[PDB]
Amino acid sequence: MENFQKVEKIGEGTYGVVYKARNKLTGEVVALKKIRLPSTAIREISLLKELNHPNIVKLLDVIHTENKLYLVFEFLHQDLKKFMDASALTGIPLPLIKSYLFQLLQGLAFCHSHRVLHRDLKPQNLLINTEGAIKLADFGLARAFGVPVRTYTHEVVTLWYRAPEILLGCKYYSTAVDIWSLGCIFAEMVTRRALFPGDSEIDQLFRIFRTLGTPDEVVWPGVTSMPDYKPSFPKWARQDFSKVVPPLDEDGRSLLSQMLHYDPNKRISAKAALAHPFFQDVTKPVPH
Ligand SMILES: COC1CCN(c2nccc(Nc3cc4c(ccn4C4CCCC4)cn3)n2)CC1
């Protein structure tokens, strides 16, 4: 696009390269995603231009030209993954964790109210600024393109935040899949280690089962009829959350437990999570 001066490469996304760029006319600084490209995808993505919220990265423009799709986003200076890594020695202070979770739930509540799911939440698509805001990036792209096994650069797309219903082969995802992912990220902020760092679909599932118990018809009606469910799955006992996310307090453990319910019908909604007692003393700290 003749209107954009590339400043520097930001990274490699799932679908294409991302550059920091400047608009040659307006001087606006943006994040420019270049995807090597489907008419249904364009329709779907174009409708995301109206899905505006303070905790969703703004989609400024969608430019389809010469069999390439450019997505022009607001620029944020850092992702949560880098912040977590830089905070590895001391950890992210609880009040900032709480603020971030609160804001992310607001973002989800908004998108879910418009029946738009993310489906591939991970620390790398959560973006932060120096004023204490956090925003969800790439919302809606999974419905338009699918979530592939490998990225455009052949990198493995992480399974760590994937909900069990997806792993077990359900074709119809609900908004609950995003609550699962956010619960995994919450736990990761608190403990400074990924909750379920699976390196294959079955390793991912068995890591979930080892912590939360192997699901059965008691806790998840219909689970044994799911496409990829096998009666031969080992039967692991459920662990206490006290062991899973120390030293998180009882309000946080309660919220996390409800975000990781097996049955997507039982899993807490973003709206209901915002009303949880964990947020009674929520503040908006500024990060290091
Ligand atoms: C997977 O590669 C990651 C590399 C590190 N990250 C990053 N570091 C600095 C600034 C920034 N700014 C930024 C990134 C943005 C947007 C809108 C979308 N993205 C990325 C997020 C996931 C892939 C597209 C706005 N600012 N992002 C996220 C992308």
Curated annotation (Swiss-Prot):
UniProt PTM comment: Phosphorylated at Thr-153 by CDK7 in a CAK complex. Phosphorylation at Thr-153 promotes kinase activity, whereas phosphorylation at Tyr-15 by WEE1 reduces slightly kinase activity. Phosphorylated on Thr-14 and Tyr-15 during S and G2 phases before being dephosphorylated by CDC25A. Nitrosylated after treatment with nitric oxide (DETA-NO).
Q: Where, per the database record, does this protein carry Phosphothreonine?
A: T14, T153
* N-acetylmethionine modification, residue list: M1
Residues recorded as binding ATP, renumbered to this chain, are: 10-18, 33, 74-76, 79, 122-125, 138
Localization per Swiss-Prot or TrEMBL: Cytoplasm, Cytoskeleton, Microtubule organizing center, Centrosome; Nucleus, Cajal body; Cytoplasm; Endosome
Q: Which GO terms describe its molecular function?
A: ATP binding; cyclin binding; cyclin-dependent protein kinase activity; cyclin-dependent protein serine/threonine kinase activity; magnesium ion binding; protein domain specific binding; protein serine kinase activity; protein serine/threonine kinase activity
Enzyme Commission identifier(s): 2.7.11.22
Please name the GO terms of the biological process aspect recorded for this protein, alphabetically. Answer: cell division; cellular response to nitric oxide; cellular senescence; centriole replication; centrosome duplication; chromatin remodeling; DNA repair; DNA replication
Induction profile: Induced transiently by TGFB1 at an early phase of TGFB1-mediated apoptosis.
Q: How is the cofactor bound?
A: Binds 2 Mg(2+) ions.
Instruction: Name the Gene3D superfamilies for this protein.
Output: Phosphorylase Kinase, domain 1 (3.30.200.20), Transferase(Phosphotransferase) domain 1 (1.10.510.10)
Q: Name one Pfam family in it.
A: Pkinase
Q: Which InterPro entries match?
A: CDK (IPR050108), Kinase-like_dom_sf (IPR011009), Prot_kinase_dom (IPR000719), Protein_kinase_ATP_BS (IPR017441), Ser/Thr_kinase_AS (IPR008271)
Residues reported to bind Mg(2+): N125, D138
Q: Which positions carry the signal peptide feature in this UniProt record?
A: none
- Disulfide bond as a keyword of this entry, yes or no, is no
Q: Which cofactor does it need?
A: Mg(2+)
Protein kinase domain span: 4-279
What changing T14A does, per the record, is: 2-fold increase in activity
**Protein family per UniProt:** Belongs to the protein kinase superfamily. CMGC Ser/Thr protein kinase family. CDC2/CDKX subfamily.
**What does the record give as the function of this protein?**
Serine/threonine-protein kinase involved in the control of the cell cycle; essential for meiosis, but dispensable for mitosis. Phosphorylates CABLES1, CTNNB1, CDK2AP2, ERCC6, NBN, USP37, p53/TP53, NPM1, CDK7, RB1, BRCA2, MYC, NPAT, EZH2. Triggers duplication of centrosomes and DNA.
Name assigned to this protein = Cyclin-dependent kinase 2
UniProt organism field: Homo sapiens (Human)
